[PDB]
């Protein structure tokens, strides 16, 4: 067989798999036969072949770094990506040419008690951290960041280069010793990509929200948040969507949540509704602070409740219908607002019923008459004036009576007055569609 005559034709096809030159199938078998013959002979000459292959791989990359260690951005990125697919695929013919040096000697060399003996492909990947870990580690990461920093205007970011860079960084995870592999991706690219993202978005938020109103920033923030999700899924590795998104909200809207409540009140004074929906959508992504712009609405609805009843005038004391209609419209407008804008959220509806019960009971008229029981009396007079001799409307109208009935908080006056007028109605037979009264009793039974 021999041991040294082979290492003059071997290291002529080992140098031919590299510098890809379209090998035939009669030369692959010759190299495999050389490796097999060396491996089976009588004691496989120790570990000579492994050491020679290690030295060849270490010398091949040392001379390869001489041309490319002085390349700047967009040129070192085109030198890494091209001379990484030429090395990953080339060190796979070498992983099945030296297949006999992987089945018997490597599985038996290791697994007895030994470290530092890897398979040929894993050895080549380990040795590739003799070119990445000198420049490259930070000569192309800076180039990738500079290319990414074309979110401003620059299109055609050349997705292929960055994709190849991240694929190489992910594949280079620690295969040494032991037996995902995101141990280099995080410490070499992701740690200095987020810190660049905050730097970029702490300089655009403080520069856009100084010449444009808060509304335009609200629309730009949604677009930027959506854009920093399609930038992922193209240079992805996954494992970064649930981390970049979190550190893209704390800089856009978690620290600008000072002039948002002021703008919230300004839009609440007006009739802007899609703007409030965008505000709620942006704030809802951030916990611990959705509830601050929930008391402002609760106060605004209460003020609007006390505003229409003061604009009601002096007739509200003797006009139950108008008094009920005022609070009904006030409830309807903001109930529609809550259902449409704030996604029918339980907290916002709850804020709606904690202010409706505070301008129905102790608002004006109930102060003019020096009694908070003037509201149940007016509702009792209204339901009588509607359900009295004078059909679909006489159902939704009683439902609109029911919705304001829930906020009275004192029913003794209502029951007393309603019975007082119902007795007079029934005795004199001043009732129309007695089934309406039956439905009224059923509705009250369903309620308290």
């Amino acid at each position: 067989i021999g041991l040294d005559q082979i290492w003059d034709d071997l290291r002529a096809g080992i140098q031919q798999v590299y510098t890809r030159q379209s090998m035939a199938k009669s030369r692959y078998m010759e190299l495999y036969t050389h490796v097999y013959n060396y491996c089976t002979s009588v004691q496989f000459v120790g570990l000579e072949l492994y050491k020679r292959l290690k030295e060849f791989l270490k010398n091949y990359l040392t001379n390869l770094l001489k041309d490319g260690e002085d390349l700047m951005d967009e040129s070192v990125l085109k030198f890494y990506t091209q001379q990484w697919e030429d090395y990953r695929f080339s060190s796979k013919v070498l992983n099945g040419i030296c297949a006999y040096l992987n089945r018997h000697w490597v599985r038996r060399e290791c697994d007895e008690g030994r470290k530092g003996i890897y398979e040929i492909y894993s050895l080549a990947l380990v040795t590739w951290r003799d070119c990445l870990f000198r420049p490259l580690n930070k000569q192309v990461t800076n180039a990738v960041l500079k290319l990414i920093e074309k979110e401003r205007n620059g299109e055609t970011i050349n997705t292929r280069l960055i994709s190849g860079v991240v694929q190489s960084y992910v594949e280079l995870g620690l295969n040494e010793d032991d037996a995902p592999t995101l141990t280099v991706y995080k410490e070499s690219f992701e740690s200095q990509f987020l810190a660049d993202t905050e730097r970029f978005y702490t300089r655009e938020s403080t520069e856009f929200l100084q010449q444009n109103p808060v509304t335009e920033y609200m629309k730009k923030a949604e677009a930027r948040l959506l854009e920093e999700q399609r930038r992922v899924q193209v240079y992805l590795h996954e494992s970064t969507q649930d981390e970049l998104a979190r550190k893209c909200e704390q800089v856009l809207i978690e620290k600008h949540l000072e002039i948002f409540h002021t703008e919230f009140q300004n839009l609440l004074d007006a009739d802007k509704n899609e703007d409030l929906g965008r505000m709620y959508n942006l704030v809802s992504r951030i916990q611990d602070g959705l509830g601050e712009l929930k008391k402002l609405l609760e106060t605004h609805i209460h003020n609007q409740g006390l505003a229409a009843i003061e604009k009601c005038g002096e007739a509200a004391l003797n006009d139950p219908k108008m008094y009920v209609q005022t609070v009904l419209d006030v409830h309807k407008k903001y109930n529609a607002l809550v259902m449409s804008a704030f996604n029918n959220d339980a907290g916002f509806v709850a804020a709606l019923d904690k202010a409706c019960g505070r301008f129905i009971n102790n608002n004006a008229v109930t102060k003019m008459a020096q009694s908070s029981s003037k509201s149940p009396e007016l509702l009792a007079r209204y339901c009588d004036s509607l359900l009295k001799k004078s059909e679909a409307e006489l159902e939704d109208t009683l439902n609109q009576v029911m919705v304001v009935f829930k906020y009275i908080e004192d029913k003794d006056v209502f029951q007393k007055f309603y019975a007082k007028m119902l007795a007079k109605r029934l005795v004199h037979q001043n009732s129309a569609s007695d089934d309406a009264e039956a439905s009224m009793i059923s509705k009250l039974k369903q309620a308290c």
Partner: protein
């Protein structure tokens, strides 16, 4: 023609097809090359010296000195060694993974103590009828080896919840737990083995002192595969519903010797059971309708072993066979009101189903087709 011209790997593969007796008494007496080939390290580290009563004297030190890095041992049914034949082996073998010492009553706590203190990486401890083992040796097992993936503490009437809690505190990577009829183990251990072990697949508490109050604390394990709740103190009935319904990964259900279990449980199990593959019903009060539910309202099933049930009559076994889309075992096993005439034609009509019946002794009295020589 020379067998010695072959590569050493080829000869090692050939020798791996011979057992230990023919490898230490025949191959080692041919030539020095074969002796040196049979003394390799791959032929060791899988000792498996069980049932060697008058063999393993104070000799394991000789086997451990000349052959290190043993990754699996089997000293079951042993009767010769003292404690200081294991306590020294762990001192010389830092790579045990599959220690197994079933039914070796001559050992004590100190063996487990030494194994835990000298084997930082261990994945399997199976000790059986070894009454002498206390919680004092288990505390050091659950506090020094956080790598056990499978345990077996069957028939040791000295293990209480005190050491079980210590074991459950660590050993987060536990997959299988088996526990035979040993007292002093209550719901306090089951309530802690579901909160500190979310990778459990096999659970067995046969003959234990557990109650449905702790058994109901099992729906929190989403990776449950098999259950062995046989002959427990109390199970109630809704716990079965809320265990089978939530853990949609159960393949075996060995609820056995539980008197209060009724037919509705079997019916709802058939309705809900998607991944169920092994139902074990013995002596339960189910009356000729559980089989119908199993065969009609269940899609995945292969074995049913209704046996020693005081109410199991014909037209139930004959109906599940025609109703079930899949059935490979319908063991009867002392169901007294099943006519042997019924399953003689029922067996031949449905060859794909095999039945276990007291009259099915001819299946055993067919292994004579290999030896015969009796009559």
């Amino acid at each position: 023609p020379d067998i010695n011209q072959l590569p050493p790997s080829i000869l090692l593969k050939i020798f791996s097809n011979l057992s230990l007796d023919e490898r230490c008494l025949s191959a080692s007496l041919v030539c020095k090359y074969w002796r040196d080939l049979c003394l390799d390290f791959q032929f060791w580290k899988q000792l498996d010296l069980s049932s060697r009563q008058q063999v393993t004297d104070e000799l394991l030190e000789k086997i451990a000195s000349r052959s290190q890095n043993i990754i699996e041992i089997n000293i079951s049914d042993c009767r010769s060694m003292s404690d200081n034949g294991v306590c020294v082996l762990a001192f010389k073998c830092p790579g045990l993974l599959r220690y197994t010492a079933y039914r070796c009553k001559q050992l004590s706590d100190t063996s487990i103590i030494a194994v835990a203190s000298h084997c930082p990486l261990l994945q399997k401890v199976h000790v059986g009828n070894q009454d002498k083992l206390t919680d004092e040796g288990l505390k050091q097992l659950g506090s020094k080896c956080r790598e056990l993936k499978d345990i077996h503490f069957g028939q040791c009437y000295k293990i209480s919840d005190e050491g079980m809690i210590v074991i459950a505190k660590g050993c987060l990577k536990l997959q299988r737990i088996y526990m035979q009829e040993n007292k002093l183990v209550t719901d306090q251990s089951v309530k802690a083995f579901a909160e500190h072990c979310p990778e459990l697949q096999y659970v067995g508490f046969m003959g234990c002192s557990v109650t449905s109050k702790g058994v109901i604390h099992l729906t929190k394990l989403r990776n449950l595969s098999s259950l062995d709740l046989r002959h427990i103190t109390e199970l109630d009935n809704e716990t079965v519903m809320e265990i089978v319904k939530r853990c949609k990964n159960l393949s075996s259900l060995n609820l056995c010797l539980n008197w209060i279990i009724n037919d509705r449980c079997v019916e709802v199990i058939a309705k809900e059971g998607q991944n169920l593959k092994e139902l074990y019903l013995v002596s339960c009060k189910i009356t000729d309708y559980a089989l119908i539910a199993i065969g009609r309202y269940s899609m995945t099933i292969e074995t049913v072993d209704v046996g020693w049930c005081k109410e199991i009559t014909d037209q139930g076994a004959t109906l599940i066979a025609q109703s079930s889309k899949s059935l490979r075992y319908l063991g009867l096993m002392r169901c007294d009101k099943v006519n042997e005439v019924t399953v003689e034609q029922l067996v031949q009509q449905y060859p794909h189903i095999t039945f276990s019946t007291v009259l099915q002794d001819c299946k055993r009295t067919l292994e004579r087709a290999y030896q015969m020589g009796w009559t």
